Design an enzyme around this catalytic site. Structure first.
Site, PDB file in Angstrom:
ATOM      1  N   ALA B  99       0.814  -1.206   0.000  1.00 15.10           N
ATOM      2  CA  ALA B  99       0.000   0.000   0.000  1.00 15.10           C
ATOM      3  C   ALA B  99       0.852   1.262   0.000  1.00 15.10           C
ATOM      4  O   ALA B  99       0.316   2.367   0.060  1.00 15.10           O
ATOM      5  CB  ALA B  99      -0.936  -0.002   1.194  1.00 15.10           C
ATOM      6  N   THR B 179      10.539   5.121   8.496  1.00 12.99           N
ATOM      7  CA  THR B 179      11.000   5.660   7.227  1.00 12.99           C
ATOM      8  C   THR B 179       9.891   6.402   6.473  1.00 12.99           C
ATOM      9  O   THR B 179      10.112   6.848   5.363  1.00 12.99           O
ATOM     10  CB  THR B 179      11.630   4.577   6.330  1.00 12.99           C
ATOM     11  OG1 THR B 179      12.310   3.623   7.149  1.00 12.99           O
ATOM     12  CG2 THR B 179      12.626   5.191   5.373  1.00 12.99           C
ATOM     13  N   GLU B 254     -13.950  -9.052  29.509  1.00  8.61           N
ATOM     14  CA  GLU B 254     -13.497  -8.519  30.796  1.00  8.61           C
ATOM     15  C   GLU B 254     -12.599  -7.300  30.631  1.00  8.61           C
ATOM     16  O   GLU B 254     -12.615  -6.399  31.468  1.00  8.61           O
ATOM     17  CB  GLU B 254     -12.747  -9.579  31.601  1.00  8.61           C
ATOM     18  CG  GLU B 254     -13.621 -10.462  32.460  1.00  8.61           C
ATOM     19  CD  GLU B 254     -12.797 -11.384  33.337  1.00  8.61           C
ATOM     20  OE1 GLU B 254     -12.356 -12.439  32.836  1.00  8.61           O
ATOM     21  OE2 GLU B 254     -12.584 -11.050  34.524  1.00  8.61           O
TER      22      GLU B 254
HETATM   23  N1  LIG Z   1       7.606  -2.197  16.588  1.00  6.27           N
HETATM   24  C1  LIG Z   1       7.677  -2.422  15.269  1.00  6.27           C
HETATM   25  N2  LIG Z   1       7.317  -1.445  14.422  1.00  6.27           N
HETATM   26  C2  LIG Z   1       7.375  -1.627  13.095  1.00  6.27           C
HETATM   27  C3  LIG Z   1       7.831  -2.903  12.590  1.00  6.27           C
HETATM   28  N3  LIG Z   1       7.792  -2.836  11.268  1.00  6.27           N
HETATM   29  C4  LIG Z   1       7.342  -1.617  10.950  1.00  6.27           C
HETATM   30  N4  LIG Z   1       7.096  -0.903  12.038  1.00  6.27           N
HETATM   31  C5  LIG Z   1       6.590   0.463  12.071  1.00  6.27           C
HETATM   32  O1  LIG Z   1       5.418   0.517  11.286  1.00  6.27           O
HETATM   33  C6  LIG Z   1       5.417   1.673  10.474  1.00  6.27           C
HETATM   34  C7  LIG Z   1       5.469   1.221   9.037  1.00  6.27           C
HETATM   35  O2  LIG Z   1       4.400   0.329   8.822  1.00  6.27           O
HETATM   36  P1  LIG Z   1       4.589  -1.147   8.301  1.00  6.27           P
HETATM   37  O3  LIG Z   1       3.961  -2.028   9.305  1.00  6.27           O
HETATM   38  O4  LIG Z   1       5.994  -1.339   7.910  1.00  6.27           O
HETATM   39  O5  LIG Z   1       3.694  -1.050   6.991  1.00  6.27           O
HETATM   40  P2  LIG Z   1       2.717  -2.093   6.291  1.00  6.27           P
HETATM   41  O6  LIG Z   1       1.599  -2.320   7.203  1.00  6.27           O
HETATM   42  O7  LIG Z   1       3.481  -3.209   5.686  1.00  6.27           O
HETATM   43  O8  LIG Z   1       2.205  -1.092   5.166  1.00  6.27           O
HETATM   44  P3  LIG Z   1       2.649  -1.032   3.641  1.00  6.27           P
HETATM   45  O9  LIG Z   1       4.027  -1.576   3.691  1.00  6.27           O
HETATM   46  O10 LIG Z   1       2.499   0.394   3.342  1.00  6.27           O
HETATM   47  O11 LIG Z   1       1.747  -1.920   2.888  1.00  6.27           O
HETATM   48  C8  LIG Z   1       6.671   2.432  10.826  1.00  6.27           C
HETATM   49  O12 LIG Z   1       6.351   3.367  11.840  1.00  6.27           O
HETATM   50  C9  LIG Z   1       7.571   1.403  11.432  1.00  6.27           C
HETATM   51  O13 LIG Z   1       8.377   2.001  12.422  1.00  6.27           O
HETATM   52  C10 LIG Z   1       8.203  -3.909  13.582  1.00  6.27           C
HETATM   53  O14 LIG Z   1       8.597  -5.008  13.221  1.00  6.27           O
HETATM   54  N5  LIG Z   1       8.106  -3.608  14.860  1.00  6.27           N
END
Ligand SMILES: Nc1nc2c(ncn2[C@@H]2O[C@H](COP(=O)(O)OP(=O)(O)OP(=O)(O)O)[C@@H](O)[C@H]2O)c(=O)[nH]1
Ligand SMILES: Nc1ncnc2c1ncn2[C@@H]1O[C@H](COP(=O)(O)OP(=O)(O)CP(=O)(O)O)[C@@H](O)[C@H]1O
Ligand SMILES: CO[C@H]1C[C@H]2CC[C@@H](C1)N2c1c(-c2c(F)cc(F)cc2F)c(Cl)nc2ncnn12
Ligand SMILES: Nc1nc2c(ncn2[C@@H]2O[C@H](COP(=O)(O)OP(=O)(O)O)[C@@H](O)[C@H]2O)c(=O)[nH]1
Ligand SMILES: [Mg+2]
Ligand SMILES: [Mg+2]
Ligand SMILES: [Mg+2]
Lengths: 339, 435, 413, 54
Positions: B99, B179, B254
């Site tokens: 996305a 990022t 709960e």
């Molecule tokens: N805590 C944590 N945060 C994450 C991780 N991977 C991504 N994020 C956070 O999630 C945000 C990016 O979203 P992602 O979850 O990578 O995106 P996605 O849901 O795959 O969305 P698209 O790639 O756009 O399809 C950023 O703020 C990252 O810092 C993870 O493994 N752990």
């Protein structure tokens, strides 16, 4: 080098603090909305503490303690003193006060109860109502309660210490700086704000004689001392010559104790010791002295102005202990009140 | 036994999902092959851990979970990881292009095409459930899939399973490990749409976890692995009451009953102690309990001292007895600034599991005799909304990046509509916690 | 995540050839197309730019020109033999430095043959993310035919990302009299039909070669400099970092028309030194001074083994010391990625990608040369002689002037 | 200072402490919004292709 912003222009103290930082050369003033700063001289109301301390790689500092308003509003202070175990109602240095709400959580009934116990015993029953405008000094609760048109009814100090010559009352203002380590610093220079009118116990109607505000007094003026401002060297000399005592012994010990009691009471509630951002703040404490040389706390100012003579020294003190201690640059004027 | 279905959406949801199910397997003695020696029921049983694992005739214990991402890079690691044999391929769902950190692209353009397939896979899990309690939804606020598809899914789950409860574990965006510049948009957009469909949402701020990892485990630049390992411990503590015999928080309802007196204010703050590095070479009940009131141990950086509590739950693991807890509470009640709303009693619900917290071998978190997780509904968490709303306002004032959303079929009105809802939410928190 | 690469014209093909020379080395592919690398990290994303044949890797690259000269030169030196022979698409007429010839007449008869090659490469893509074009805006083929290609590719692939490495006219160094016409007409197209455009200027490339870095620089030197940059900005796409062209564009482009980037490169230098170099004007390859505008967004990519905690310190430092040059109203507009595989000959390197409003200086410079000639209709007959109307010139000029004022709007906001 | 609802088990126990007393859209509506957005996409692409055909 460091960066800062200016939230509130109207501040006389931090306007001066602003210039002296810029002058050092090692400080850059960003626009107020720029969120990449290290220091914030913030607004007096609804300061956004919640947004502080979240910019990565930026040690942020703000010139206000969130929650210090508990001390600095007159309804808040009364509630704080009455309900804090530390104050414990063991506050012999705060005038008997009550919180009244306009008929338009309240203790109007207990006030009348104390007022009436007093009048049964023929004890002096003069009180003052407050919240230059909006104060009424009356010897009768009816005249106090028809000012009902949130307020504080406080026992009026009917026997104040009066300066001679002049037979005139006065107020003392102390400036207190709390750093990010919650060290309590008392500015060694206080000021006495004088009445230029002889005190009169029969007439409370002419408020100016009763009150000491530089505002009301402005409007005889400057006859005894300039701008009705007597500083500590003169007042200490007066105490020695008139009452055979010193300012340190008779008055300052009590002032230091009160300042300590107030700020240590709220320290676990407002300390930024283990926070992601940190706070310092300058306070103005107002005291009155009765004829038996007992000190009473009247009010705490969270956003205080200084005396023209001392604007130079105090504002330099702030930069030195409160700001440069967090952001170092390339015979202290403060007394440290230990815990 | 009432079953629970877990749904992991997008990169954040899926990778945390990995850490959680790894930890679950360790806690229950389930091996990467899916066999569970201690389970003498075979291909059957009503046990508490059965709420999270179903069983095959060959004695394989399988997670009641769906992994879904719009691109295959992340889930392919699950398919080939150490615990690969634990999942059936049905469970792992991938699209082929993501996305692009665009809520509109995840919710509308791609969501429409994959929503039915996802629901059908969930339906397969539900069909294997005698009694189904609800779902646990793991996702980021900031990703396109995490924000956009999750909100679509939540709406559809409300339709398909109206009675069932829904719980979120949500990753709040932090610039240090992010990022994407458009995260503020995606966060308030997904929050707006998902609000009336979530019964209880646990927010975790990557900023808080990043810092806890740097300062308590002495890691200079934490990775997602580091952050997720820690997050899974908090999640495990929260979900342990479902997977183990207990009487506190045994059914998803709960959580709402104990933590949420107001529907819209369903974002409890989590705090966890102790966090100690494995490297480094202990804490009493009163000490770890007092730690829970330190901002530096919170999943979200905010100051509860300047907010009001609505509910508080203490979840202990390892050695802990009730009298010690009562004692610690009493000494804290004296020292620290704790205030509750006038309409709520000033009290604590406490749960103790005897099994000490488990830790992944070779990990950074040293094993602890005693550990506690506090869940409190405090108005102070609204600081996180204000932070996020401010960044939103800064960009939307210039309509920065807005064209990416309109181009995917979204209307500019949905931006303002969402922002307005957030504003209302902030006011709700102010009315409740400020006098 | 496959990318289709197109190079057009002499500059386009010379720079493109050097690019494939560079990244083939990085993925360890030799001039026959055979893989001889030490690591399997080289092939995990090799599909993004190469097709698998069979134990042989073939660049998904399409080479285009209106004269056979440069194409023959590409085929001669290595890695000339790695390219699919049926992906060479050339004519014989040339374009005579005439945008109209490239876009409307000579170019139009060649364009279908390119699209057939594009279409055949696209069909062997499991999921095409988009296209990248390398060309110059000064001449006729890269400028005229190049923008024609972009338009027709957009028509057949409207939902794919289109990126360009575009060589722009130099402030003081030019070898083509009609260059302001060709460039202004190209920019008009670029503003509408590309998602990201990296602005390359030959004068800037030369000064870097001549001063910082190597007396008597040649085109081979400048082309190598561009390739290093091109290698850098595409590191995240072909190595294991999360990511794709659309995700990049979403975070780099706050406003659709403002998608023209200033690329930069650095450099035993230390991290802190790398960081302060890559932000320096003299390291800019677009001859615009970043200190004359503000950054809307910035992407920095670090390659090699290095302290990544140290790198983030350095990145934050620099912004904090220059917060005046970044827009306030785009929070966290500076991003940073790190890749562990360094470019060759370097222990570590850093690639800079800035979306700066300072780039308006380039377009207003192009605009002032264009209007000087067009006000007197100088050399205009060569263009109207190919069928163009004067109104098309007025429109191109107005659009670019519009572009300039938009940069000014956000510079002051 | 009261303690109540002490439930207990092998696994662990739970209880409550009190320190002081007090004092959805249909599947059609979703479909409609998803289809409206799709239409706004289709329309925008239609304009582009019209513009390009011109
Ligand atoms: N805590 C944590 N945060 C994450 C991780 N991977 C991504 N994020 C956070 O999630 C945000 C990016 O979203 P992602 O979850 O990578 O995106 P996605 O849901 O795959 O969305 P698209 O790639 O756009 O399809 C950023 O703020 C990252 O810092 C993870 O493994 N752990
Ligand atoms: N109980 C009391 N007895 C006698 N005088 C009193 C009194 N309470 C207040 N005053 C007088 O009232 C004057 C002003 O009161 P107060 O300081 O509360 O007003 P204020 O708050 O608007 C000015 P500031 O904020 O700078 O203190 C003081 O100078 C003091 O002399
Ligand atoms: C006006 O003419 C321009 C076109 C041709 C002819 C002279 C020169 C400049 N130039 C160059 C340059 C060159 C240069 F020397 C200095 C510079 F700032 C930018 C360049 F691109 C190089 Cl680097 N390599 C070349 N090979 C063949 N020409 N040619
Ligand atoms: N950087 C670089 N520029 C070149 C090269 N060859 C030609 N140019 C420049 O490109 C500009 C003209 O564009 P060109 O590609 O030659 O015209 P086209 O073939 O019609 O597209 C002139 O300024 C040339 O000096 C090269 O190998 N490298
Ligand atoms: Mg006042
Ligand atoms: Mg993703
Ligand atoms: Mg030529």
């Amino acid at each position: 080098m460091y960066t800062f912003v200016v939230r509130d222009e109207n501040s006389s103290v931090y306007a001066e603090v602003s210039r002296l930082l810029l002058a050092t050369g090692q400080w850059k003033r960003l626009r107020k909305d720029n969120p990449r700063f290290n220091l914030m001289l913030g607004e007096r109301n609804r300061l956004p503490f919640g947004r502080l301390g979240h910019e990565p790689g930026l040690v942020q500092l703000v010139n206000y303690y969130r929650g210090a308003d508990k001390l600095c509003r007159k309804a808040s202070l009364v509630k704080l003193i009455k309900t804090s175990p530390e104050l414990s109602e063991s506050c012999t240095w705060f005038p008997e006060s009550y919180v009244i709400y306009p008929t338009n959580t309240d203790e109007r009934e207990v006030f009348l109860a104390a007022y009436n116990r007093r009048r049964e015993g023929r004890e002096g029953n003069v009180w003052i109502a407050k919240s230059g405008e909006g104060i009424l000094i009356s010897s009768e609760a009816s005249e106090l309660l028809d000012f009902i048109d949130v307020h504080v009814i406080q026992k009026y100090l009917e026997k104040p210490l009066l300066l001679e010559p002049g037979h005139r009352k006065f107020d003392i203002r102390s400036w207190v700086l709390v750093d990010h380590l919650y060290n309590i610093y008392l500015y060694r220079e206080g000021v006495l704000r004088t009445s230029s009118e002889p005190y009169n116990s029969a007439n409370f109607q002419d408020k100016t004689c009763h009150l000491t505000n530089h505002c009301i007094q402005k409007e005889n003026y400057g006859r005894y001392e300039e701008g009705n401002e007597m500083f500590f060297e003169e007042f200490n000399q007066y105490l020695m010559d008139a009452l055979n005592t010193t300012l340190e012994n008779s008055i300052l010990l009590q002032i230091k104790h009160i300042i300590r009691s107030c700020l240590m009471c709220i320290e676990p509630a407002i300390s930024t010791k283990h926070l992601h951002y940190q706070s310092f703040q300058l306070f103005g404490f107002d005291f009155m002295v009765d004829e038996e040389l007992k000190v009473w706390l009247i009010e705490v100012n969270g956003a205080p102005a200084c005396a023209q003579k001392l604007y130079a020294e105090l504002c330099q003190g702030i930069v030195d202990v409160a700001i440069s201690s967090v952001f170092p640059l390339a015979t202290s004027i403060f007394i440290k009140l230990h815990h | 036994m009432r079953e629970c279905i877990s749904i992991h959406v997008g990169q954040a949801g899926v990778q945390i999902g990995n850490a959680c199910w790894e930890l679950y397997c360790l806690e229950h003695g389930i091996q990467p092959d899916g066999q569970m020696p201690s389970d003498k029921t075979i291909g059957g049983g009503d046990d508490s851990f059965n709420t999270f694992f179903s069983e095959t005739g060959a004695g394989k214990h399988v997670p009641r979970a769906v992994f879904v991402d719009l691109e295959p890079t992340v889930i392919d690691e699950v398919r080939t990881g150490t615990y690969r044999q634990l999942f059936h391929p049905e469970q792992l769902i991938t699209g082929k292009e993501d996305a692009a950190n665009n809520y509109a692209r995840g919710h509308y353009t791609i969501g429409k095409e994959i929503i039915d397939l996802v629901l059908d896979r969930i339906r397969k899990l539900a069909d294997q459930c005698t009694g189904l309690q609800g779902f646990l939804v793991f996702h980021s606020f900031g990703g396109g899939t995490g924000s956009g598809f999750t909100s679509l899914l939540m709406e559809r789950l409300s339709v398909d399973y109206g009675k069932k409860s829904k719980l979120e574990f949500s990753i709040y965006p932090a610039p240090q490990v992010s990022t994407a510049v458009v995260e503020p948009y995606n966060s308030i957009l997904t929050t707006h749409t998902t609000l009336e469909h979530s019964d209880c949402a646990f927010m975790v701020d990557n900023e808080a976890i990043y810092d806890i990892c740097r300062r308590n485990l002495d890691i200079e630049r934490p990775t997602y692995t580091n952050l997720n390992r820690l997050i899974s411990q908090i999640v495990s503590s929260i979900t342990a009451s479902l997977r183990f015999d207990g009487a506190l928080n045994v059914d998803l309802t709960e959580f709402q009953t104990n933590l949420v007196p107001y529907p819209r204010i369903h974002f409890p703050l989590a705090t966890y102690a102790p966090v100690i590095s494995a490297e480094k070479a202990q804490l009493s009940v009163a000490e770890i309990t007092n730690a829970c009131f330190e901002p530096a141990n919170q999943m979200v950086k905010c100051d509860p001292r300047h907010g009001k509590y609505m509910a508080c739950c203490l979840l202990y693991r390892g050695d802990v007895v009730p009298k010690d807890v009562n004692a610690a509470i009493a000494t804290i009640k004296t020292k620290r600034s704790i205030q509750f709303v006038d309409w709520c009693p000033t009290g604590f619900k406490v749960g103790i599991n005897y099994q000490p917290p488990t830790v992944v071998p070779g990990g950074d978190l040293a094993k602890v005799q005693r550990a506690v997780c506090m869940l409190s509904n405090t108005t102070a968490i609204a600081e996180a909304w204000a932070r996020l709303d401010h960044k939103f306002d800064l960009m939307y004032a210039k309509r920065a990046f807005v064209h990416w959303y309109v181009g995917e079929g979204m209307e500019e009105g949905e931006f303002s509509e969402a922002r307005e809802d957030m504003a209302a939410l902030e006011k709700d928190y102010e009315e409740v916690g400020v006098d | 995540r496959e990318i289709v690469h197109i190079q057009a014209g002499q500059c386009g093909n010379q720079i493109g050839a050097k690019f494939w020379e560079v990244i083939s080395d990085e993925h360890g592919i030799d001039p026959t197309g055979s893989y001889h690398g030490d690591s399997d990290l080289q092939l995990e994303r090799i599909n993004v730019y190469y097709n698998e044949a069979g134990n042989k890797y073939v660049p998904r690259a399409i080479l285009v020109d209106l004269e056979p000269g440069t194409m023959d030169s590409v085929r001669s030196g290595p890695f000339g033999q790695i390219f699919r022979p049926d992906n060479f698409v050339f004519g014989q007429s040339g374009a005579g430095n005439n945008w109209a010839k490239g876009h409307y007449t000579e170019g139009a008869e060649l364009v279908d043959s390119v699209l057939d090659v594009v279409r055949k490469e696209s069909e062997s893509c499991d999921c095409l993310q988009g296209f990248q074009l390398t060309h110059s805006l000064g001449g006729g083929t890269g400028s005229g035919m190049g923008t024609l290609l972009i338009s027709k590719i957009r028509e057949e692939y409207p939902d794919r990302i289109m990126n360009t490495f575009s060589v722009m006219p130099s402030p003081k160094v030019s070898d083509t009299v009609v260059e302001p016409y060709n460039a202004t007409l190209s920019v008009h197209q670029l503003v509408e039909n590309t998602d990201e455009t990296y602005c390359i200027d030959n004068e800037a490339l030369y000064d870097i070669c001549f001063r910082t870095l190597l007396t008597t620089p040649t085109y081979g030197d400048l082309n190598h400099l561009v390739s290093a940059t091109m290698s850098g900005v595409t590191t995240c796409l072909r190595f294991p970092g999360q990511a794709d062209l659309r995700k990049l564009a979403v975070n780099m482009v706050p406003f659709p028309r403002l998608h023209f980037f200033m690329p930069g490169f650095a450099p035993a230098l230390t991290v802190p030194e790398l960081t302060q170099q890559m932000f320096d004007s003299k390291n800019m390859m677009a001859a615009c001074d970043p200190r004359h505008g503000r950054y809307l967004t910035v992407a920095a990519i670090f390659r090699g083994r290095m302290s990544m905690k140290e790198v983030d310190e350095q990145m934050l430092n620099v912004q904090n010391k220059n917060s005046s040059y970044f827009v306030e109203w785009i929070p966290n507009n500076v991003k940073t990625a790190v890749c562990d595989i360094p470019p060759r000959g370097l222990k570590m390197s850093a690639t800079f990608i800035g979306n700066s409003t300072a780039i308006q200086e380039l377009f207003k410079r192009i605009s002032e040369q264009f209007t000087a000639m067009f006000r007197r209709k100088a050399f205009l007959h060569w263009y109207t002689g190919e069928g163009m109307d004067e109104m098309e010139f007025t429109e191109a000029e107005s659009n670019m002037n519009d572009l300039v004022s938009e940069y000014q709007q956000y510079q002051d906001a | 200072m009261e303690v109540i609802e002490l439930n207990k088990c092998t696994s662990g126990q739970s209880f409550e402490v009190i320190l002081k007393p007090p004092s959805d859209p249909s599947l059609e509506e979703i479909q409609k919004k998803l289809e409206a957005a799709e239409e706004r996409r289709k329309y925008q692409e239609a304009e582009l292709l019209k513009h390009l055909a011109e």
